[PDB]
């Protein structure tokens, strides 16, 4: 008897076969293109996509006017549209089976900081977010994997206390300007 919860889940699955060249090359491609730390982040996003595809196939086995199929398919499609992975006009459970890992990778905060020109590269974007230079609508975010919603796409701003933002300079600039 403790007032503690023990509920937790693993957020990835390891691949079944360890050393396959095509899978290794595809994972390395996605790591390099999206500036990721290791293979586990690719496996995490792959796990999320596999769970969503399993939910879509399960709802596709149901008949069209099943209330659970309509309710849960509508909720799943609404979530996928809300994080920008699917288009608003493609709200249909068949198109979920055509989704790719690259859309979920593009909706990360690292990729959006790169694509909105706040960073000169994807690795610059990662080190920018990690060092409290980025805010999303009011809130400083450190997490590169922060998945951005379409309502927060236009509010990625740039940290009103950051030296490149609000203006108060960093440690190096005060130390170097103090010499002379």
């Amino acid at each position: 008897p403790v007032a503690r919860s023990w509920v937790c889940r693993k957020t990835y699955v390891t691949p079944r076969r360890p050393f396959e060249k095509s899978r290794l090359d595809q994972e390395l491609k996605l790591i390099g293109e999206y500036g990721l730390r290791n293979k586990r982040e690719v496996w995490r996003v792959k796990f999320t996509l596999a769970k969503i595809r399993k939910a879509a196939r399960e709802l596709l086995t149901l008949d069209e006017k099943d209330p659970r199929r309509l309710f849960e398919g509508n909720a799943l499609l609404r979530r996928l549209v809300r994080i920008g992975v699917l288009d608003e006009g493609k709200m249909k459970l068949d198109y979920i089976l055509g989704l790719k890992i690259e859309d979920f990778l593009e909706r990360r905060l690292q990729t959006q900081v790169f694509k909105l020109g706040l960073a000169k590269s994807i690795h610059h974007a990662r080190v920018l977010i990690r060092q409290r230079h980025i805010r999303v609508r009011k809130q400083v975010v450190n997490i590169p994997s922060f998945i951005v919603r379409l309502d927060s796409q236009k509010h990625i701003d740039f940290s009103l206390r950051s030296p490149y933002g609000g203006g108060r300079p960093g440690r190096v600039k005060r130390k170097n300007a103090k010499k002379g």
Partner: peptide
């Protein structure tokens, strides 16, 4: 010298593998 670690080691391996 020292080898890079983390995201930088993977970036180096990617630049060697797919860029050239």
């Amino acid at each position: 010298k020292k080898k890079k670690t983390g995201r930088a080691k993977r970036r180096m391996q990617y630049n060697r593998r797919f860029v050239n």
